[PDB]
C-alpha cells in the first residue's frame, strides 16, 4: 500500500518526530471559551486539554451544561465519536448524563483508573452486581450486569436507568486493559482485535448515538482508536482504498478537538494498526482469527 511505502520511507529516513510536528503546526486552532470559564476549572482534568466551543457537547442542564467532550463527526466515513476526559471524583454523573442525552450505545475506555502509580481517572462504574452506583446530581442509577474478563480487554454490560423516567437502557463498556504504562504496544493485534470488539458489538453503529471514548485527557489512545478505525472504514468504502491519507485523517478529526495523537510514537502505530488492520479488508478472512490467537483471552 501506499501507506506501508510511506511507513517504510519514514522509517528508513527516522523522521517521525519530523512529521508529527508538522502535524502540530498544520493543527486547527479554535476557541474554547466556556472550557476556560473560571466555574468551570474542576471540570477540567488538564489545563492543557480543553473541547473546542464549536464541537463540544453540551449537558441538557440549566445550570452549566459543561463537559470536557468533543463531537469528533467524520463526514465521509459516516462515523461520528464523542472523545472525553476520564471522569473526574465530581464529574462522573455529567458523564453518564452525556451518555444518556446522546443516546450512546457504548463505552471505549484505553486506561486503568490507575497507572504510573497515579489515578488517571475516577472509579465512574460500580465494580459488583449487588452495589450499584446513583448519581444523584443527574438523578442516574447505573447497575453493573455483568463482566467479561479477557487477557487483553474488559467487556461490561451496564445498566443505566433514568431515575426521572424510569427508563433503562444497556451500556456496553469497552476496556483495552493492556496499553503500557510507557510507549506504545509494539504489536498492533491485540489493539485492533479490541476495535473489532467494539465495531461487532454494534456500539458504532449509525442506529445509536456516537460511542463515547476516553484515556485520561481523551486524545492520545483515544484519538488513535478514532483514527484507525475511520482510516479503516475508508479504505473499505473507496473506490481507490490507497488514496486513504492517516495525515489528512488525523488533520480534519483535529479540527474537532486538539492533540489528537500525542506523540510522534502514537502516530507511527497508527500508521502500524491502519496497515496492519487493512490486510482483513481485502479479502482475509482468516486474519481475524490470527489476532484473537496472536494475543491470548485468559
Known amino acids: 500500500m501506499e501507506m506501508e511505502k510511506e511507513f517504510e520511507q519514514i522509517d528508513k529516513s527516522g523522521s517521525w518526530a519530523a512529521i508529527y510536528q508538522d502535524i502540530r503546526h498544520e493543527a486547527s486552532d479554535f476557541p474554547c471559551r466556556v472550557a476556560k470559564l473560571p466555574k468551570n476549572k474542576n471540570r477540567n482534568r488538564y489545563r492543557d486539554v480543553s473541547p473546542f466551543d464549536h464541537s463540544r457537547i453540551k449537558l441538557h442542564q440549566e445550570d452549566n451544561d459543561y463537559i470536557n467532550a468533543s463531537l469528533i463527526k467524520m463526514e465521509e466515513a459516516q462515523r461520528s465519536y464523542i472523545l472525553t476526559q476520564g471522569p473526574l471524583p465530581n464529574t462522573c454523573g455529567h458523564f453518564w448524563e452525556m451518555v444518556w442525552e446522546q443516546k450512546s450505545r457504548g463505552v471505549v475506555m484505553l486506561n486503568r483508573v490507575m497507572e504510573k502509580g497515579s489515578l488517571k481517572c475516577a472509579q465512574y462504574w460500580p465494580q459488583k452486581e449487588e452495589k450499584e452506583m446513583i448519581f444523584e446530581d443527574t438523578n442516574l442509577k447505573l447497575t453493573l450486569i455483568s463482566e467479561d474478563i479477557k487477557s487483553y480487554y474488559t467487556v461490561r ?120 488492520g487493512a490486510k482483513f479488508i481485502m479479502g482475509d478472512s482468516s486474519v481475524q482469527d490470527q489476532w484473537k490467537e496472536l494475543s491470548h483471552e485468559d
Open 157 to 276: 454490560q451496564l445498566e443505566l436507568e433514568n431515575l426521572t423516567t424510569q427508563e433503562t437502557r444497556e451500556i456496553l463498556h469497552f476496556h483495552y486493559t493492556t496499553w503500557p504504562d510507557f510507549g506504545v504496544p509494539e504489536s498492533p493485534a491485540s489493539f485492533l482485535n479490541f476495535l473489532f470488539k467494539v465495531r461487532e458489538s454494534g456500539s458504532l453503529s449509525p442506529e445509536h448515538g456516537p460511542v463515547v471514548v476516553h484515556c485520561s485527557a481523551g486524545i492520545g489512545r483515544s484519538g488513535t482508536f478514532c483514527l484507525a478505525d475511520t482510516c479503516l472504514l475508508l479504505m473499505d468504502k473507496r473506490k481507490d482504498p490507497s488514496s486513504v491519507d492517516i495525515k489528512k485523517v488525523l488533520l480534519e478529526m483535529r479540527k474537532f478537538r486538539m492533540g489528537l495523537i500525542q506523540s510522534a510514537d502514537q502516530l507511527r502505530f497508527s500508521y502500524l494498526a491502519v496497515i496492519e
